[PDB]
Symmetry: D2
Subunit: 115 residues, 4 copies
């Protein structure tokens, strides 16, 4: 998998399960084309989100539905969504891991880029 995620819940100290996310690719005209959507499992990850064939070089946006994550827990969050925008160069089997630490009024997005 060239694009992976790892979401953690900073209130309970567990992975963030059942977070919905969408992957969008920026096109020539500057617009965004949705190319995939998924939901984290109980470990805060998604497997088989997009193939290397679906993941050419270019700018991508990954939108995490963090508001619903907190609302379904009875907490009231600040952010509508968490969006991670980055220029990708999957070359030489270069893989990207988007880590995300969630609190109701704050989140941290970091990237682990390999090969």
């Amino acid at each position: 998998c060239p694009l992976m995620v790892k979401i953690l819940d900073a209130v309970k100290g567990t992975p963030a399960g059942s977070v919905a996310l969408k992957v969008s690719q920026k096109t020539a005209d500057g617009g965004w084309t949705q190319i995939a959507t998924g939901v984290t499992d109980a470990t805060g990850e998604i497997h088989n989100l997009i193939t290397e064939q679906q993941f050419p070089a270019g700018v991508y946006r990954v939108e995490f539905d963090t508001k619903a994550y907190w609302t379904n827990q009875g907490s009231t969050p600040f952010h509508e969504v968490a969006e991670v925008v980055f220029d990708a160069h999957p070359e030489g089997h270069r893989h990207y891991t988007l880590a995300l630490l969630l609190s109701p009024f704050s989140y941290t997005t970091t990237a682990v880029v390999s090969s």
Copy 2:
């Protein structure tokens, strides 16, 4: 000021100065209307970024040009941009400070919301 920012540089241990940002407002049709731009001073802040007349209830987007900040610093950044997206005055009018902690491959967005 109803909308303040406070950007810090986690590499240098200083406020992030001269960071450019845009403030947008979600519209009825689901698009975005830009309402302001700004650039942080040397304390990492923008004074009088918007006024109360520009700030009715609704969803807003604050887009920080973090990639240009790290390029001018000589570092190579991951993120194309840093986006904070939130519903303003959902339960009534409030004031907002957006705290942002910047590293080349990571950032933390936090909100301080007061009456």
Copy 3:
């Protein structure tokens, strides 16, 4: 004020008020000795924590009592405490701000140095 703090609460999006902390100095022995205490006001700050005379060059440990903070909020924390250890050089009116972002199972420590 050569040593300042700013503590935020990431659960409810406010400063963290009434957080107790201890400032310790490292001894030439190798251990710690407590030189001051304080408690954050409603803005997550402590004014007049220590003086420039109490804050000479040297290694310092600031120990934030985050466990008691989350207990008094009704939450279960992970950390027994939040410690920040750094080498201070207040040379040339150089001031330190320890920014601290608190969640029950996580905290971020960062420093702003003039």
Copy 4:
């Protein structure tokens, strides 16, 4: 593996490899008794740091030598060390992962605790 770590480098976007750490166990008198040391591999993890028998309920301290890490990376760090202190109830196959995100002037410590 009841006590695991995961360290990342927020500047380069890689795991922080070759970080030294010391595991200490609070004693009845309040002192600390070192019980283990380790160094992260290239994934930012340490495997078989301590056994479940070495890890009874109690207060533990994990000290990460982040000053040496940043110096070797060519950056001047703020912190002398990163210290994670916590009360552990490892009853019923409860595992602790100490997650650590590092920048020269900032770090974030989080914990992931598995269920019994």
